[PDB]
């Protein structure tokens, strides 16, 4: 995982040095910002079945061509496999809010994604509409706090920038 903690230990291991006050002050950033990045942690974990349902069809609302045969949305268990993938992703976005960095998204969702989606005929532009619909439907004082809405959206468009 790549987090705030995991970077400075690898930087000190590269130099062959003890954790000095440059590495010590990086975890000070996990004191003021972890009050806001963990404010949006349980809002996703306590409402994970609501965000998957009315953003997973927003994939299919923009791309309704998948219901024709030969495509990926051609039968119901493929759609039942389709809602699992954005439920996998928002679990990983919740996994990167509680870790501080972008580790669990990188180690488990993005690495190797560009090789599977091309051979299995899965459009990554159809992935990115379900991700980006949760970004602009997010209200800043209603869904979460003000600084948590900046924080949760910043991990969200990293995945948009990962797939495109």
């Amino acid at each position: 995982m790549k987090s705030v903690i995991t970077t400075v230990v690898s930087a000190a291991d590269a130099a062959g040095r003890f954790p000095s006050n440059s590495d010590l002050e990086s975890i000070q950033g996990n004191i003021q910002r972890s009050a806001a990045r963990l404010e949006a942690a349980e809002k996703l974990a306590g409402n994970h079945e609501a965000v998957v349902k009315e953003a997973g069809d927003a994939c299919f609302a923009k791309y309704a061509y998948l219901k024709n045969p030969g495509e990926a949305g051609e039968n119901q268990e493929k759609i039942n496999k389709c809602y699992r993938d954005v439920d996998h992703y928002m679990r990983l976005v919740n996994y990167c809010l509680v870790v501080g960095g972008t580790g669990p998204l990188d180690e488990w969702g993005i690495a190797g994604a560009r090789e599977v989606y091309r051979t299995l005929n899965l459009p990554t532009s159809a992935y990115v509409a379900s991700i980006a619909y949760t970004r602009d439907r997010l209200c800043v004082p209603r869904d979460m706090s003000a600084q948590a809405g900046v924080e949760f959206s910043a991990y969200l468009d990293y995945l948009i920038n990962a797939l495109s």
Partner: protein, 177 residues
């Protein structure tokens, strides 16, 4: 590798659940003792030069058999490597106290080391007496109960941070002996 914040991720990924109100009491407490934790690493980075010499000469005062000819401190080349690797495992446990987990020990310190030390002629009895004596030197710096050097700090109980490093030293002193 892992850490403390990544441990509750892979504990939640072991069943593919989320991280909600059940697993967050260990992690919402972790930011509260973070200023205890950042003051614990600052205590151990201050004094690493003597506490390896406290350990590798305390190994001498109970075991002079390596300065006996044919030992492992007879050579000045070998006595540097006992001082160089006396602090690397001290550098790795200070990595583990900053990480909140001993994940960096079982790949960068522990794994390979027993197969290393058979191919060097390393006395395995010297391994356990070196780490356990500097274990008491480590918690004396953490609980500020070092009887020839004191330090200024903020008041409060700190034995939870003294027990966390006490769970690290018996890991590495076990398999290589």
């Amino acid at each position: 590798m892992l850490d403390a914040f990544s441990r509750v991720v892979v504990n939640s990924d072991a069943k593919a659940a989320y991280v909600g109100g059940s697993d967050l009491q260990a992690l919402k407490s972790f930011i509260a003792d973070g200023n205890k934790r950042l003051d614990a690493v600052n205590s151990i980075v201050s004094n690493a030069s003597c506490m390896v010499s406290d350990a590798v000469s305390g190994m001498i005062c109970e075991n002079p058999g390596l300065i006996s000819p044919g030992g492992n401190c007879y050579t000045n080349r070998r006595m540097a490597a006992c001082l160089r690797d006396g602090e690397i495992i001290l550098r790795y446990v200070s990595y583990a106290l900053l990480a909140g987990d001993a994940s960096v020990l079982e790949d960068r310190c522990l794994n390979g080391l027993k197969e290393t030390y058979i191919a060097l002629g390393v006395p395995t009895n010297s391994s356990i007496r070196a780490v356990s004596i500097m274990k008491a030197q480590a918690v004396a710096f953490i609980t500020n109960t070092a009887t020839e050097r004191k330090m200024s700090f903020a008041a409060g109980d700190c034995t939870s941070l003294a027990s966390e490093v006490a769970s690290y030293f018996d890991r590495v002193g076990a398999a290589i002996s």
